[PDB]
Amino acid sequence: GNPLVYLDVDANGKPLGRVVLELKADVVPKTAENFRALCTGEKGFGYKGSTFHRVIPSFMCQAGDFTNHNGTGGKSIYGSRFPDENFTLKHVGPGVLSMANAGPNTNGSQFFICTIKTDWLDGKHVVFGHVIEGMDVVKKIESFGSKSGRTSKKIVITDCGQLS
Numbered sequence: 327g328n329p330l331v332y333l334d335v336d337a338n339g340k341p342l343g344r345v346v347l348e349l350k351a352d353v354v355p356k357t358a359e360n361f362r363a364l365c366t367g368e369k370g371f372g373y374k375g376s377t378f379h380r381v382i383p384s385f386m387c388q389a390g391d392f393t394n395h396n397g398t399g400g401k402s403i404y405g406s407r408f409p410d411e412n413f414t415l416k417h418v419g420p421g422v423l424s425m426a427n428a429g430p431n432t433n434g435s436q437f438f439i440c441t442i443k444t445d446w447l448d449g450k451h452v453v454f455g456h457v458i459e460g461m462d463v464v465k466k467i468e469s470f471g472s473k474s475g476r477t478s479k480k481i482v483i484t485d486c487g488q489l490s
């Protein structure tokens with residue numbers, strides 16, 4: 327059964343609500359497992375307390391740099407980086423959950439949630455899940471972005487974990 331995980335998100339210390347994500351372990355088990363464990367924090371590190379550092383309206387909301395907190399960092403549960411598992415799932419529309427990277431085979435912890443179909447990322451970024459609940463929260467996050475990706479409010483994942 328594909329994991330369901332959650333992110334509770336704040337903007338300037340005000341709760342926006344919860345984003346629930348299905349992780350497609352049936353298609354990308356290694357990538358799903360990484361995200362799942364980073365949500366629970368069971369390895370001793372993970373997403374709790376980290377930010378959405380790059381948010382671009384009509385594109386995506388990017389997060390997951392819990393080491394450098396600026397978009398340069400993060401790490402996986404396997405080591406600093408891990409391979410692109412496959413490109414079977416596509417960036418089909420809003421709600422798609424996908425790994426950020428710095429080129430082929432550089433997956434760490436950084437991820438993004440799409441707010442549109444981002445088809446030009448197919449074959450470059452590993453899609454590994456989608457929003458089950460909380461697109462309204464994602465739209466709120468999106469509304470605090472800008473063309474440059476700089477956020478107008480501090481967007482923090484206050485809590486995260488696994489539902490099932």
Ligand SMILES: COc1ccc(OC)c([C@H]2CCCN2C(=O)CNC(=O)NCc2ccc(N)cc2)c1
Pocket residue numbers: 386388397398399400425426427428432433434435436438446447475
């Ligand atoms: C055509 O590819 C893209 C174009 C624009 C863009 O945002 C400006 C992106 C951003 C949002 C879509 C996700 N994405 C990236 O992955 C940009 N790359 C990074 O932010 N790289 C920093 C980084 C460093 C280490 C690790 N492990 C992952 C990412 C990608």
